[PDB]
Amino acid sequence: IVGGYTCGANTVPYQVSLNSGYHFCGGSLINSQWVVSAAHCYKSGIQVRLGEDNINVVEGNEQFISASKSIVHPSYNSNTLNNDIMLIKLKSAASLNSRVASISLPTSCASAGTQCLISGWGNTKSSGTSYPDVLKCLKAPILSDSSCKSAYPGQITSNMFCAGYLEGGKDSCQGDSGGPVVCSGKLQGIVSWGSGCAQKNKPGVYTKVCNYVSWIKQTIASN
Ligand SMILES: [Ca+2]
């Protein structure tokens, strides 16, 4: 997250870190057994880390639970990142509590102009590299479809939306991928892609979770 703020420990209790020996992506806990993340975060051998604030210190509220199954969307296209969504099943259910909690799936799609909370342990620099240990947060508005398409001509599908600031300075970034975009208390987006981070005219692009709720509900009813 570039141009964000330190969230505060466990203030984003649905945020997970995906670990394969190291943090590599975020995700969102949607019930005690299942995480939503980006399909481009697929790796074999994932451990889900819940209750994290500093990902490099065991502070006492974590739950570390191996994935048993990962399910990339059936129409995921890794070239365009259309349908950039994955489900991860945990080997055992998380213990839900004040620090480890699920986020609701949406009923309606969020509106242009709505301010959403984006979070993660990704890079904090637009130019260069610095990865934080503690979770970072950013409030960013959803941009109009027209503005999104103008920013990325020929690249935005109806399963994507842009959020952020066209002047630059504030965005998600590498290492935030797969994490949550929460608007009106529901999971509306997944950190997916963007040209660089926090560059002028190149806002973040996010998977439009409201298009996937029926797939998510039938898949978790079946696995
Ligand atoms: Ca920790």
Swiss-Prot record:
Synthesized in the acinar cells of the pancreas. The active site is at residues 40, 84, 177. It is found in: Secreted, Extracellular space. Disulfide bonds join 7-137, 25-41, 109-210, 116-183, 148-162, 173-197. GO terms for molecular function: endopeptidase activity; metal ion binding; serine-type endopeptidase activity; serpin family protein binding. Keywords: Calcium, Digestion, Disulfide bond, Hydrolase, Metal-binding, Protease, Secreted, Serine protease, Signal, Zymogen. Ca(2+) binds at residues 52, 54, 57, 62. Subsequent cleavage after Lys-125 leads to alpha-trypsin. Further cleavage after Lys-170 yields pseudotrypsin. A cleavage may also occur after Arg-99. Its EC number is 3.4.21.4. Substrate binds at residues 171-172, 174-175, 177. Belongs to the peptidase S1 family. It is an enzyme of class 3 (hydrolase). The gene is PRSS1. GO terms for cellular component: extracellular space; serine protease inhibitor complex. Binds 1 Ca(2+) ion per subunit. This is Serine protease 1. Is inhibited by scorpion cyclotide trypsin inhibitor TopI1. It comes from Bos taurus. PANTHER family: RIKEN CDNA 2210010C04 GENE, TRYPSIN-RELATED. Interacts with SERPINA1. One of its GO terms (biological process) is proteolysis.
